[PDB]
Design an enzyme around this catalytic site. Sequence first.
Site: not given
Length: 272
Positions: A36, A62, A67, A107, A124
Amino acid sequence: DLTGYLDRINYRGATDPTLDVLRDLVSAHTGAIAFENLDPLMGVPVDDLSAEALADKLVDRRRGGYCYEHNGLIGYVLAELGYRVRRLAGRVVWLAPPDAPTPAQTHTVLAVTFPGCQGPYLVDVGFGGMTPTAPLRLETGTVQQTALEPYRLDDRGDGLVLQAMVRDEWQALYEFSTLTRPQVDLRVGSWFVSTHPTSHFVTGLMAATVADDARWNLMGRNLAIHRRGGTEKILLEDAAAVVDTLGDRFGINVADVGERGRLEARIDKVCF
Ligand SMILES: CC(C)(COP(=O)(O)OP(=O)(O)OC[C@H]1O[C@@H](n2cnc3c(N)ncnc32)[C@H](O)[C@@H]1OP(=O)(O)O)[C@@H](O)C(=O)NCCC(=O)NCCS
């Protein structure tokens, strides 16, 4: 920390740094912590990549993350378990043209070894919609099965490209060097992705998780569910609906964001 985490992902669970344990961890983690971008989308950069900062967010509070947060976190954890972790950087090429202005290195992934392992593995848990939900052998040419789609690594550069079969085609996900990158490069990359005003992580909403046995992908108010290749589509009716989906379905703690009126209007602007 680790009992905070092993409990958050619901792993229980042997902790010896073996292949079995790496598969099961990568499985539980991708099943429990959504991808998210609520922060960047709310103008909150993702800047602090420390164990304490990521643990506080993805475990205690939570939330999901992206990435840098996912592979940051699961990287501090495997290290702790006695795996040997190298952080790598990559450029995303998922659904890129032709056209292709060379993409930024936005990334981060992991090359992991462990006692008596058969070679390095790629970890990943933070790509989002197409993340591999198993460690993959860091080897070129081999087609590698998972609980969901198959994966393949090929030579490109200088580096590798990870591809996955989606529908009836191999699709390229990201290109990457096997060279270790210092934390500071990861932080610079994160600053870019979370603050650059043309970043897709700043200007839209994206979420992904895996709930059995399927990819649940959210892009704006479009929810796609890929189970055994078949795509089911749900158009969310309003911002209230999208926030509810992020909370139930994606299991994100939305109040942590956390004035629901403010999240709803960003979603409505965005969106909508
Ligand atoms: C936002 C995101 C979660 C949503 O993915 P999505 O909702 O499936 O939509 P995408 O744009 O990715 O995919 C487009 C197409 O591929 C299809 N597709 C994607 N995954 C599929 C799968 N698991 N099986 C079958 N089809 C799939 C989609 O149905 C869609 O097809 P269509 O529009 O032609 O019908 C995803 O694009 C994403 O995680 N972004 C990449 C993250 C990134 O930049 N890297 C991480 C660095 S932080």
